Design a protein around this ligand. Structure first.
Ligand code: EZE
Length: 271
């Protein structure tokens, strides 16, 4: 699939940089024709078949195809796609409130964010989309100054359609947040996202990462072994029902882990 090959600078003006990654940079931008503001994600293309730098066109097209499907208040939306010899440029919804990461919470404040995350993931999983990269860095806010901000899931760079219940691909996500099946290179499905939500919930309530070791290999080994516990110093005033929610997500066997529908019916969440 080919994208718009006119010069993006003829239609948008860029401004403040919003984020920077290994093969992508995100810049605030403004469309000349409407004055409306967006985020332009510039993704570096691979320049040869066998190269390791840049993103393969297969991976870019999968991300764009997934982004084109989604329209939900808790997920970022795609406006337009451009390309040139060097980059594919996604013109994405502007989410300006910064990361949930940059932003310890009470259980009401945690659940207010968490319910929005669960609503967004329920939408994705309903469409058989696994995100595969859920972490606080990929949960942004629309306005960080209100008492209960509205969140958007970003970064569909690892997302995959799961039309056979599982996919057999390697997912190089962030060690602190990936499920054991990712660590062990096993078939992957929607369940991996539910583990990541469990990690996110643990951090939201305590300010501490449940599996984090001193090195990446330590973290991965801890994930695979389900080596975590609720430290009383951090959880002494957290309800047992909040701990129950986390415990039913941080489960090694994906078949025994709570699904997104289970998580919405769990007594800590269900109104
Ligand atoms: O408005 C903003 C601000 C910001 O810091 C990041 C983004 C989007 C990042 C992003 C979204 C979708 C995707 O497939 C990949 C991405 O990197 C949007």
């Amino acid at each position: 699939t080919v994208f718009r090959q006119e010069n993006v600078d003829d239609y948008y003006d860029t401004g403040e940089e919003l984020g920077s990654g290994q093969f992508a940079v995100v810049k605030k931008c403004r469309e000349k024709s409407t004055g409306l503001q967006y985020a332009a994600k510039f993704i570096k293309k691979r320049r040869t078949k066998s190269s390791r730098r840049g993103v393969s066109r297969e991976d870019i097209e999968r991300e764009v195809s997934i982004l084109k499907e989604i329209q939900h208040p808790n997920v970022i939306t795609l406006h337009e796609v451009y390309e040139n010899k060097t980059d594919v440029i996604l013109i994405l919804e502007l989410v300006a409130g910064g990361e949930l990461f940059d932003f310890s919470l009470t259980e009401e404040e945690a659940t207010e964010f968490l319910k929005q995350i669960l609503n967004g993931v329920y939408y994705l999983h309903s469409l058989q989309i696994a995100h595969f990269d859920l972490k606080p860095e990929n949960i942004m806010l629309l306005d960080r100054n209100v008492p209960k901000p509205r969140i958007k899931i970003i970064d569909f760079g690892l997302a995959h359609k799961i039309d056979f219940g599982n996919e057999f691909k390697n997912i190089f996500g962030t060690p602190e947040f990936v499920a054991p099946e990712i660590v062990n290179y096993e078939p992957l499905g929607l369940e991996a996202d539910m583990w990541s939500i469990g990690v996110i919930t643990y951090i939201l309530l305590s300010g501490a990462s449940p599996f984090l070791g001193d090195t990446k290999q330590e973290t991965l080994a801890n994930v695979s072994a389900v080596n975590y516990e609720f430290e009383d110093e951090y959880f002494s005033n957290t309800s047992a029902l909040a701990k129950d929610f986390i415990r039913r997500l941080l489960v090694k066997d994906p078949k025994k882990r709570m699904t997104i529908q289970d998580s919405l019916q769990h007594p800590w969440i269900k109104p």
